[PDB]
Amino acid sequence: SQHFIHARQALLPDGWAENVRIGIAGGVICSIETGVLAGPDDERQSVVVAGMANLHSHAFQYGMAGLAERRGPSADSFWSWREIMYKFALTMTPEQAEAVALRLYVDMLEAGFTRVGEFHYLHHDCDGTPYANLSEMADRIAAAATTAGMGLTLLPVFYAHSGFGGAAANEGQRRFINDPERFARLIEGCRKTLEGFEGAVLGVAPHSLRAVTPDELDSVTQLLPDAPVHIHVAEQVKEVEDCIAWSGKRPVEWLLDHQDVTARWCLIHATHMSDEETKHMAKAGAIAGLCPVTEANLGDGTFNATEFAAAGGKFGIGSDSNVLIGIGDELRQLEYSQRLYHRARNVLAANEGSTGRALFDGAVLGGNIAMGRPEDGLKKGASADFVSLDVERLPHAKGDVVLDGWIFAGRAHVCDVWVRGVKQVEGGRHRLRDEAERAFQKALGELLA
Amino acid sequence: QHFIHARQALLPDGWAENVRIGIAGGVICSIETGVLAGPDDERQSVVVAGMANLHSHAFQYGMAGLAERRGPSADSFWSWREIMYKFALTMTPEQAEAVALRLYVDMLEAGFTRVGEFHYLHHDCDGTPYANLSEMADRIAAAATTAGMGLTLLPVFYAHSGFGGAAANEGQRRFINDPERFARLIEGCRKTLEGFEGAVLGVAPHSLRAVTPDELDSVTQLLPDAPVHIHVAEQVKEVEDCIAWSGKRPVEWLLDHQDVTARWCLIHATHMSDEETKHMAKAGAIAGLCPVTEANLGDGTFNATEFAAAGGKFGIGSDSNVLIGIGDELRQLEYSQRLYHRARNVLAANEGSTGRALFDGAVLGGNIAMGRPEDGLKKGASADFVSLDVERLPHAKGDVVLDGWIFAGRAHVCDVWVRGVKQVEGGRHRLRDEAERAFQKALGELLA
Ligand SMILES: [Fe+3]
Ligand SMILES: [Fe+3]
């Protein structure tokens, strides 16, 4: 039946409003009324904001979080990360993958993310042979999301090569590999699995320009022409240099010249762009899939955030390596990367407004577009996906001040979280945290033994 | 003697297992490894040293989260100074004590066991001294006492608004003293800290902009065996103004005109050449790093690898007190380096854990900057330490626990002891809710 949340303040697309009654029916927002008293059966909340998309995740990497911070003996300071990543990637079973993904999605839900964009490349069995059920590993993701009550935009990854110009994939990549034919069949397995997964979106994820040839890129991005396309691009300086050596062009530039890039596309990282690439990307409408915590943890670089925003570019955030899960963590890192690079404060604020406000609104907006859910948000007809904040330490704080306290000062935290109208998180706790954790610790023990 | 048994404890020479720590009169009397818990031992999983928070301006905790609006000014730092001066110029002593208490509770809950209060809010709202000259410093001491927080109090000497002895401006009126009145204030602080167990009293020349060379000589001679702290080279604009005045940057100037040693803690030290960095390390000055505040202010990135390779030591301070956390500070330090050098595990030592190196480093340099080199998980040290909740890392080795805490959000502070007294239990200070009520009342008054 029809259920009501009454919020003392709620951040709607046209701004903060007070005394907001949000009606929910069949998991959808059926009504929003501002300046009204709570009905006697309304559930009362202090501060309500939209659910955040987590637009880029590799669920299995959550298992290695905190384990890649030892330097090791290599001259290459990235060796330890790849060694740990491939130890997990090459041994994880489907049962383990479901357990890890579940506990990750619980952590994301508890942090206020209501949908995940799972950029999924862990496909085949340990020897690189397909599972009897081709989409087995994607089915585990979907099962994990279903159990969590987490929204899912599933983005199976196309990966065939180890370098520019169609270099053969090496044996370490064997569980990731498909040709376009076997990839289409995998996408078909995913579509069947997602039947009855309410709100699910199925797109495609060419891994990167290194990993895919131009012809393969054409085939993959034509499979589901109305659904999202995600791709890693321009994350590390070495890729830009290699791309130039191969084509005479930088990665984003090359992509914009060879594909019809639109808001259908989400370019993950896009960390190293010229001013011209930044503008063209924004003008094309491609969403920047920013992963600020992972980019810092990997030493990738700093995004051209002010230029991108000034050109009308839109963005979202993704936990990516899943080393550390938090909306405040990601947005704060984005802003602070800018403050250090430009020697300035409140860099990503819009007009003379709040930096937390601009970042939060922006990341919700661009995130939902990248997820294929532009109808979503705190709007009539959107999925009933939203978050209440604990403002016990900010008792008189009016809207934007709440966001800045949350994101910069640690003075608020996520309280309740709803997805499709179902309260998955209460007072910061997911209804299945402890059960998910027990299964996660069992899987970790197996993987690390 | 009462006893804590730790399944793992990070001692100065490394992780030890099944460690019995005996405490009496607030100090560590015995350390035994490889043994079971006695029947009256309190049991802990993972115990580490208490962290010094080597640089704090307590009153700025009140403005945390309030300076993140861009505002109409061409100067993107205007809004921070406007908020900072609104609090600085109107706060009463009663309000200052409430703010400092709630801050010191927050610090304790984050695993900091001593605070270096770099204290410059001295006089009344109109810039006239209080009947008790050290009134505001007495409030700091009272707040620290109520929290059970260790205190190295560093009253600040401030006399000028510009290099070369420019007059102090009206906005600085609560901060200012001449050397003679400053010495009298220090004397008030010494009397107040009598019976404050483990307290240290040093001096804090504000910066090279705020002091002349002659004043710097006088202030740093007052307590020759106690710490000296000073802000240096935090912002490019200070560095340029210092050059305009002397032909030198702030740290090189300081090293050339003072006998800088491990007695000195140079706060930020953010803009240095490679040669300055090495000379600072070789002198033995402690880098008072404030990574979260430096990021929030867009100050810059510290020359961390060069400093460490030259044998430099550091600690961490919450500084503006915008966000309080050991993980937050150490992570930000490392990540500032990863982005700047396009590398990972930049501040690891040998081929070790980055979290290990950063944690050990910050405890060590922190305690030296605080005038407490005897401290740590050692016999004779103050019984100041922290247990970590390892429910998500249930049998993980020590270094893995640190990396999980600092980088992955997988462990958190459980209990915290200062001078052998448990001030935090399962993440909560006993006075959290009471201190919070008084804090919100003060905030409401200040923001009215
Ligand atoms: Fe990624
Ligand atoms: Fe400071």
Burial annotation B198-208 (CB, 10 A radius, 16+ → b, else e): bbbbbbbbbbb
Q: Tokens 């016999």 identify what position? A: B379
Three-state secondary structure along B87-137?
A: HHHHCCHHHHHHHHHHHHHHHHHHCEEEEEEEECCCCCCCCCCCCCCCHHH
Q: Which ligand is nearest to the CA of B268?
A: 2
* CB–CB contact B344 A81 (8 Å): yes
Compute, in angstroms, the gap from residue A196 CA to the centroid of ligand 2: 57
Instruction: Tell me which residue of A151, A150, A148, A152 sits closest to A435, measured CA to CA.
Output: A148
Amino acid identity for residue B381 in this structure = A
Query: Token pair of A138, please?
Result: 């994607």
Question: Which long-range contacts link A168-174 to residues 24+ away (Cβ below 8 Å)?
Answer: A169/A211, A171/A128, A172/A86, A172/A90, A174/A124, A174/A127, A174/A128
Q: Which residues of A are annotated as a binding site?
A: 56, 58, 232, 320
Q: C-alpha B141: how far from its chain's center?
A: 15
Tokens of A389: 């904040």
User: Strand ranges (DSSP E) for A275-404?
Assistant: 287-290, 314-317, 386-390
Residue A322: list chain B partners with CB under 8 A. none
Bridge partner residues of A174 (DSSP): none
Task: List all residues 6 or more positions away from A88 whose beta carbon is below 8 Å from its beta carbon.
Answer: A60, A61, A63, A64, A447
Tell me, rounded to whole angstroms, the distance of Cα A322 from its chain centroid: 10
Q: In chain B, what residues touch A296 (CB-CB under 8 Å)?
A: 335, 338-339
- Taking phi over 0 as left and psi of -120 to 50 as alpha, with beta for the rest, B344 belongs to beta
Q: Are B431 and B406 spatial neighbours (Cβ–Cβ below 8 Å)?
A: no
For residues B30 and B379, the answer to whether their CB atoms sit within 8 Å is yes
Q: B319, B384, B389, B403: which is the annotated catalytic residue? A: B319
Contact at 8 Å (CB) between A147 and A440? no
Residue A432's identity, in one-letter code, is L
Q: Are A317 and A272 in contact (CB under 8 A)?
A: no
Q: How far apart are CA B316 and CA A75, in angstroms?
A: 29
By three-state DSSP, how is residue B46 classified?
Answer: strand
Between vectors from CA B341 to CA B336 and to CA B346, what angle results, nearest 5°? 70
- Chain A CB contacts of B325 under 8 Å are 410
Tokens for A5, please give them. 């949340």
CB atoms < 10 A from the CB of A262, how many? Answer: 11
| CB-based contacts of B351-354 (< 8 A; 24+ apart in sequence) | B351/A70, B351/A71, B351/A72, B351/A73, B352/A70, B352/A71, B352/B399, B353/A69, B353/A70, B353/B399, B353/B400, B353/B402, B353/B403, B354/A69, B354/A70, B354/A71, B354/B403, B354/B407
Phi-psi region of A69 (alpha: psi -120 to 50; beta: other; left: phi over 0): alpha
Token pair of A357, please?
């406000």
- For helices A237-247 and A251-258, angle between their N-to-C axes, nearest 10 degrees: 50
Q: B206 CA to middle of ligand 2, Å?
A: 9
Report the side by side order of strands in the sheet with A28-33. Answer: A28-33, A15-25, A3-12, A43-50, A386-390, A413-419, A422-426, A429-430
Angstrom distances, CA of residue A407 to CA of A328, A356, A360, A363, B117: 4, 6, 9, 13, 26
Residue B337 phi, psi (nearest 5): -70, -40
Alpha-carbon distance A251 to A233, whole Å?
Answer: 6
Angle at A415 between CA A412 and CA A421, to 5 degrees: 140
Helix (H) or strand (E) holding B206: none
Q: How far is CA A331 from CA A245, A292, B169, B205, B299, in A?
A: 34, 8, 37, 36, 19
Q: Would you state the structure tokens that stand for residue B184, as one six-digit string?
A: 């009298």
Cβ-count burial B52-64 (b if 16+ within 10 Å, e if not): bbbbbbbbbbbbb
For residue B169, the 8-state DSSP code is P
Nearest residue of A to residue B336, measured between CA atoms: A296
Q: Measured in angstroms, how far is the CA atom of residue A56 from the centroid of ligand 1?
A: 6
Instruction: Judge whether B231 is annotated as a binding position.
Output: yes
User: What residue type is assigned to position A270 of the chain?
Assistant: A
Q: How many residues does chain B have?
A: 448
Q: In A, which residues are within 8 Å of B394 by CB distance?
A: 441
Contact A69 B392 (CB under 8 A): no
Question: Which among A32, A36, A86, A39 is positioned nearest to A63, based on CA atoms?
Answer: A86
Backbone angles phi, psi at B365, to 5 degrees: -70, -35
Domains and CATH numbers, chain A: 1-51+374-428 (2.30.40.10), 52-373+429-449 (3.20.20.140)
Task: State how far the Cα of B237 lies from the Cα of A280, in Å rounded to an integer.
Answer: 35
Cα of A207 vs centre of ligand 1, distance in Å, is 9
SS3 A297: helix
Structure tokens at A293: 């915590």
DSSP designation for A339: H
Tokens representing B152 are 């190295």
* Rounded Cα–Cα distance for residues A336 and A355 (Å): 11
Residues with CB under 5 A from ligand 1 (ion): A 320
For chain A, the distance separating the N- and C-terminal CA atoms, rounded to the nearest angstrom, is 49
Instruction: Kindly determine whether residue B65 and residue A336, on different chains, have CB atoms separated by under 8 Å.
Output: no
d(CA A138, CA B377): 49
Active site residue B268: yes
Of the residues B5, B268, B279, B429, only one is catalytic, namely B268
Contact between residue B419 and residue B383 where contact means Cβ atoms under 8 Å apart: yes
Residue A232: strand pairing partners: A208, A268
B257 in a known ligand binding site: no
The residues that bridge with A52 in the sheet, in sequence order, are: A113
- B236 CB-contact burial (10 Å; exposed 0-12 / middle 13-18 / buried 19+): middle
How many of the other CB atoms lie within 10 Å of CB of A4? 18
Cβ proximity of B289 and B268 under 8 Å = yes
Q: Looking up tokens 């953010």, which residue turns up?
A: B270
| Binding site members of A for Fe(3+) | 56, 58, 232, 320
Q: Which residues of A touch B398 (CB under 8 A)?
A: none
- Distance (Å) from the C-alpha of residue B336 to the closest C-alpha of chain A? 8
Q: Which of B10, B70, B4 is nearest to B403 (CA)?
A: B10
CB contact at 8 A, B399 and B356 = yes
Q: At what angle do helices A94-110 and A433-448 cross, to 10 degrees?
A: 140
Nearest to A298 among B344, B352, B409 (CB): B344
Q: How far apart are CA B430 and CA B423, in angstroms?
A: 7
By C-alpha distance, the chain B residue nearest A64 is: B408
Structure tokens at B353: 């854990």
Query: Taking the CA atoms of chain A, what radius of gyration do you get in angstroms?
Result: 21
| Ligand nearest to the CA of residue B231, numbered in listed order | 2
Q: Hunting for tokens 């930096």 — which residue is that? A: A355
For the purposes of burial, counting CB atoms within 10 Å of the CB of B72, is it exposed (0-12), middle (13-18) or buried (19 or more)?
Answer: exposed
Tell me the Cα Rg of chain B.
21
Helix, coil or strand: residue A31: strand
Secondary structure (3-state) at B378: coil
Residue count of chain A, please give it: 449
Q: Do A410 and B324 touch (CB under 8 A)?
A: yes
Count of beta carbons in the 10 Å neighbourhood of residue A251: 28
- Under a CB-based contact definition with an 8 Å cutoff, are residues A324 and A317 in contact? no
Taking the CA of residue A216 and the nearest CA in chain B, the distance in Å comes to 31
Residue pair B342/A299 in contact (Cβ under 8 Å)? The answer is: yes
Instruction: Report the alpha-carbon distance of residue B243 to residue B443 in Å, rounded.
Output: 40
Closest by alpha carbon to B236, among B280, B267, B288, B271? B271
Q: Are A159 and A176 in contact (CB under 8 A)?
A: yes
DSSP string, A380-431: TTSB--EEEEE-TT-TT--HHHHHHHHHHS---EEEEEEETTEEEEETTEET
CA A211 to ligand 1 center in whole angstroms: 13
Question: Residue A82: closest CA among chain B residues belongs to which residue?
Answer: B344
Cα distance between residue A30 and residue A15, in whole Å: 19
B80 to chain A: which residues are within 8 Å by CB? 345
| Number of other CB atoms surrounding residue A249 within 10 Å | 16
Strand B160-162 and strand B166-167: the pairing is antiparallel
Chain A: nearest CA to B79, how far in angstroms? 9
> Alpha-carbon distance A56 to A155, whole Å?
9
Centre of ligand 1 from the C-alpha of residue A58, in Å = 7
Residue among A345, A351, A408 whose CB faces B297 most closely: A345
Tell me the two tokens of residue B108: 């304790």
Q: Exposed, middle or buried, A179 (CB in 10 Å: 0-12/13-18/19+)? A: exposed
Q: Biggest alpha carbon distance in chain A?
A: 68
Dmax (CA) of chain B: 67
